[PDB]
PDB file of C-alpha atoms in Angstrom:
ATOM      1  CA  UNK A   1       8.174  14.023 -12.448  1.00 48.71           C
ATOM      2  CA  UNK A   2       7.382  11.051 -10.192  1.00 50.59           C
ATOM      3  CA  UNK A   3       3.820   9.741 -10.305  1.00 48.33           C
ATOM      4  CA  UNK A   4       2.319   6.998  -8.140  1.00 49.54           C
ATOM      5  CA  UNK A   5      -1.000   6.095  -9.793  1.00 49.56           C
ATOM      6  CA  UNK A   6      -3.391   4.021  -7.680  1.00 50.17           C
ATOM      7  CA  UNK A   7      -6.255   1.864  -8.902  1.00 53.19           C
ATOM      8  CA  UNK A   8      -8.466  -1.016  -7.789  1.00 52.33           C
ATOM      9  CA  UNK A   9     -10.316   0.170  -4.670  1.00 50.20           C
ATOM     10  CA  UNK A  10     -13.975   0.764  -3.947  1.00 49.27           C
ATOM     11  CA  UNK A  11     -16.805  -0.981  -2.149  1.00 51.36           C
ATOM     12  CA  UNK A  12     -16.792  -4.629  -1.103  1.00 49.13           C
ATOM     13  CA  UNK A  13     -18.863  -6.808   1.188  1.00 47.08           C
ATOM     14  CA  UNK A  14     -17.505  -8.239   4.425  1.00 44.82           C
ATOM     15  CA  UNK A  15     -15.423 -11.296   3.601  1.00 44.32           C
ATOM     16  CA  UNK A  16     -14.604 -10.077   0.097  1.00 43.60           C
ATOM     17  CA  UNK A  17     -11.358  -9.468  -1.736  1.00 46.18           C
ATOM     18  CA  UNK A  18      -9.721  -6.544  -3.523  1.00 40.47           C
ATOM     19  CA  UNK A  19      -6.372  -5.985  -5.213  1.00 39.99           C
ATOM     20  CA  UNK A  20      -4.993  -2.453  -5.187  1.00 40.50           C
ATOM     21  CA  UNK A  21      -2.427  -1.427  -7.782  1.00 37.40           C
ATOM     22  CA  UNK A  22       0.139   1.380  -7.651  1.00 36.08           C
ATOM     23  CA  UNK A  23       2.026   2.157 -10.867  1.00 36.76           C
ATOM     24  CA  UNK A  24       5.273   4.077 -10.353  1.00 36.11           C
ATOM     25  CA  UNK A  25       6.420   6.311 -13.227  1.00 38.39           C
ATOM     26  CA  UNK A  26       9.172   8.877 -13.599  1.00 39.59           C
ATOM     27  CA  UNK A  27      11.273   7.251 -10.896  1.00 39.81           C
ATOM     28  CA  UNK A  28      14.760   8.851 -10.884  1.00 44.19           C
ATOM     29  CA  UNK A  29      16.612   6.364  -8.660  1.00 43.87           C
ATOM     30  CA  UNK A  30      18.175   2.926  -8.995  1.00 42.93           C
ATOM     31  CA  UNK A  31      16.558   1.796  -5.737  1.00 45.17           C
ATOM     32  CA  UNK A  32      13.225   2.169  -3.986  1.00 47.19           C
ATOM     33  CA  UNK A  33      10.961   0.933  -1.314  1.00 47.73           C
ATOM     34  CA  UNK A  34       7.190   1.095  -1.794  1.00 48.12           C
ATOM     35  CA  UNK A  35       4.551   1.011   0.947  1.00 45.73           C
ATOM     36  CA  UNK A  36       0.825   0.831   1.221  1.00 47.03           C
ATOM     37  CA  UNK A  37      -0.452   3.006   4.073  1.00 49.11           C
ATOM     38  CA  UNK A  38      -4.037   3.443   5.184  1.00 49.90           C
ATOM     39  CA  UNK A  39      -6.029   5.991   7.172  1.00 53.01           C
ATOM     40  CA  UNK A  40      -9.211   4.667   8.747  1.00 53.92           C
ATOM     41  CA  UNK A  41     -11.971   7.047   9.898  1.00 54.67           C
ATOM     42  CA  UNK A  42     -10.843   9.098  12.883  1.00 53.71           C
ATOM     43  CA  UNK A  43      -7.539   7.201  13.093  1.00 52.26           C
ATOM     44  CA  UNK A  44      -3.984   8.153  12.264  1.00 55.97           C
ATOM     45  CA  UNK A  45      -2.356   6.936   9.064  1.00 56.80           C
ATOM     46  CA  UNK A  46      -0.613   3.594   9.564  1.00 56.45           C
ATOM     47  CA  UNK A  47       1.611   1.373   7.478  1.00 56.26           C
ATOM     48  CA  UNK A  48       0.001  -1.732   5.997  1.00 57.52           C
ATOM     49  CA  UNK A  49       2.739  -3.312   3.886  1.00 53.94           C
ATOM     50  CA  UNK A  50       6.164  -2.643   2.407  1.00 54.51           C
ATOM     51  CA  UNK A  51       8.406  -4.012  -0.334  1.00 55.25           C
ATOM     52  CA  UNK A  52      11.613  -2.840  -1.939  1.00 55.23           C
ATOM     53  CA  UNK A  53      13.897  -3.217  -4.942  1.00 54.56           C
ATOM     54  CA  UNK A  54      15.929  -5.722  -2.888  1.00 56.93           C
ATOM     55  CA  UNK A  55      13.583  -7.132  -0.222  1.00 57.08           C
ATOM     56  CA  UNK A  56      10.442  -9.235  -0.542  1.00 57.78           C
ATOM     57  CA  UNK A  57       7.154  -7.891   0.737  1.00 61.06           C
ATOM     58  CA  UNK A  58       6.236  -7.742   4.427  1.00 58.71           C
ATOM     59  CA  UNK A  59       3.011  -6.861   6.243  1.00 58.02           C
ATOM     60  CA  UNK A  60       3.349  -4.345   9.085  1.00 59.20           C
ATOM     61  CA  UNK A  61      -0.250  -4.269  10.303  1.00 55.97           C
ATOM     62  CA  UNK A  62      -1.609  -6.900  12.640  1.00 58.60           C
ATOM     63  CA  UNK A  63      -4.151  -8.827  10.617  1.00 56.31           C
ATOM     64  CA  UNK A  64      -3.986 -12.620  10.142  1.00 58.18           C
ATOM     65  CA  UNK A  65      -1.854 -14.787   7.838  1.00 59.36           C
ATOM     66  CA  UNK A  66      -3.382 -14.084   4.418  1.00 57.51           C
ATOM     67  CA  UNK A  67      -5.373 -10.887   5.017  1.00 56.96           C
ATOM     68  CA  UNK A  68      -2.822  -8.790   3.099  1.00 52.52           C
ATOM     69  CA  UNK A  69      -0.137  -9.742   0.568  1.00 55.23           C
ATOM     70  CA  UNK A  70       2.156  -7.247  -1.136  1.00 53.23           C
ATOM     71  CA  UNK A  71       3.870  -8.060  -4.418  1.00 53.38           C
ATOM     72  CA  UNK A  72       5.266  -6.261  -7.410  1.00 52.85           C
ATOM     73  CA  UNK A  73       5.710  -6.568 -11.144  1.00 51.91           C
ATOM     74  CA  UNK A  74       9.155  -5.147 -11.850  1.00 50.04           C
ATOM     75  CA  UNK A  75       8.665  -4.814 -15.620  1.00 50.02           C
ATOM     76  CA  UNK A  76       5.439  -2.837 -15.083  1.00 57.47           C
ATOM     77  CA  UNK A  77       6.908  -0.809 -12.172  1.00 59.33           C
ATOM     78  CA  UNK A  78       3.756  -1.684 -10.237  1.00 55.85           C
ATOM     79  CA  UNK A  79       3.189  -2.732  -6.620  1.00 53.05           C
ATOM     80  CA  UNK A  80       0.070  -4.624  -5.554  1.00 54.43           C
ATOM     81  CA  UNK A  81      -1.824  -5.024  -2.295  1.00 53.70           C
ATOM     82  CA  UNK A  82      -3.917  -8.185  -2.344  1.00 55.18           C
ATOM     83  CA  UNK A  83      -6.631  -8.030   0.318  1.00 55.78           C
ATOM     84  CA  UNK A  84      -8.679 -11.045   1.376  1.00 56.76           C
ATOM     85  CA  UNK A  85     -11.336 -11.776   3.996  1.00 56.27           C
ATOM     86  CA  UNK A  86     -11.949  -8.056   4.381  1.00 55.54           C
ATOM     87  CA  UNK A  87     -13.660  -6.724   7.495  1.00 55.71           C
ATOM     88  CA  UNK A  88     -15.509  -3.455   8.217  1.00 55.00           C
ATOM     89  CA  UNK A  89     -12.437  -2.165  10.118  1.00 53.02           C
ATOM     90  CA  UNK A  90     -10.441  -2.401   6.878  1.00 54.25           C
ATOM     91  CA  UNK A  91     -12.449   0.577   5.600  1.00 56.79           C
ATOM     92  CA  UNK A  92      -9.945   3.366   4.985  1.00 54.41           C
ATOM     93  CA  UNK A  93      -8.279   5.528   2.385  1.00 56.98           C
ATOM     94  CA  UNK A  94      -5.314   3.474   1.167  1.00 56.48           C
ATOM     95  CA  UNK A  95      -2.180   5.310  -0.016  1.00 52.72           C
ATOM     96  CA  UNK A  96       0.786   4.221  -2.090  1.00 51.16           C
ATOM     97  CA  UNK A  97       4.107   5.734  -1.034  1.00 52.54           C
ATOM     98  CA  UNK A  98       7.669   5.564  -2.337  1.00 52.34           C
ATOM     99  CA  UNK A  99      11.180   6.521  -1.265  1.00 53.06           C
ATOM    100  CA  UNK A 100      14.739   5.905  -2.465  1.00 53.90           C
ATOM    101  CA  UNK A 101      15.927   3.939   0.591  1.00 53.16           C
ATOM    102  CA  UNK A 102      15.499   0.206  -0.024  1.00 55.04           C
ATOM    103  CA  UNK A 103      15.157  -0.882   3.598  1.00 54.22           C
ATOM    104  CA  UNK A 104      11.627  -1.418   4.914  1.00 57.77           C
ATOM    105  CA  UNK A 105      10.079   1.406   6.955  1.00 56.64           C
ATOM    106  CA  UNK A 106       6.664   1.813   8.584  1.00 56.30           C
ATOM    107  CA  UNK A 107       7.114   5.562   9.160  1.00 56.62           C
ATOM    108  CA  UNK A 108       5.119   7.862   6.890  1.00 58.50           C
ATOM    109  CA  UNK A 109       7.708  10.610   7.501  1.00 56.81           C
ATOM    110  CA  UNK A 110      10.279   8.535   5.575  1.00 56.85           C
ATOM    111  CA  UNK A 111       8.297   8.701   2.294  1.00 56.24           C
ATOM    112  CA  UNK A 112       8.555  11.744   0.005  1.00 58.54           C
ATOM    113  CA  UNK A 113       6.225  10.519  -2.777  1.00 54.04           C
ATOM    114  CA  UNK A 114       2.546   9.671  -2.369  1.00 54.71           C
ATOM    115  CA  UNK A 115      -0.346   8.464  -4.466  1.00 55.74           C
ATOM    116  CA  UNK A 116      -3.719  10.202  -4.493  1.00 56.72           C
ATOM    117  CA  UNK A 117      -5.431   7.870  -2.001  1.00 60.64           C
ATOM    118  CA  UNK A 118      -7.957   5.135  -2.843  1.00 59.21           C
ATOM    119  CA  UNK A 119     -11.130   4.669  -0.797  1.00 59.20           C
ATOM    120  CA  UNK A 120     -11.948   1.122   0.294  1.00 59.03           C
ATOM    121  CA  UNK A 121     -15.314   0.624   2.016  1.00 59.24           C
ATOM    122  CA  UNK A 122     -16.132  -2.775   3.522  1.00 57.55           C
ATOM    123  CA  UNK A 123     -19.821  -3.146   4.274  1.00 59.47           C
ATOM    124  CA  UNK A 124     -21.078  -5.000   7.329  1.00 59.60           C
ATOM    125  CA  UNK A 125     -22.880  -8.329   7.408  1.00 61.58           C
ATOM    126  CA  UNK A 126     -26.443  -8.549   8.673  1.00 59.36           C
ATOM    127  CA  UNK A 127     -26.922  -8.960  12.432  1.00 56.94           C
TER     128      UNK A 127
END
């Protein structure tokens, strides 16, 4: 059985940082790509970042150079989403997703395996 186990979310102040982790276990294939998706309140689920067994990580979502960084630890079968300079509009449920195809895809329909979803809430600054 495939499991994608997420960790590392929660509440953060505007401007803060978080690193999400997704540990892949039970993977039956010699290849993969892994994505982080997110679903913000009232919005459709959208791709944030992708990485694969052959390609370095890319960020799909318009952000700013350094807002998101995706990486992986191959020995630990774990993919990471480093988030910096977080803003209220980064509040969302973040999802890990996996598929056999090692190209990079932003389409949720291409992914047959999903993590449980991790809430990230970015509070606002006083004004």
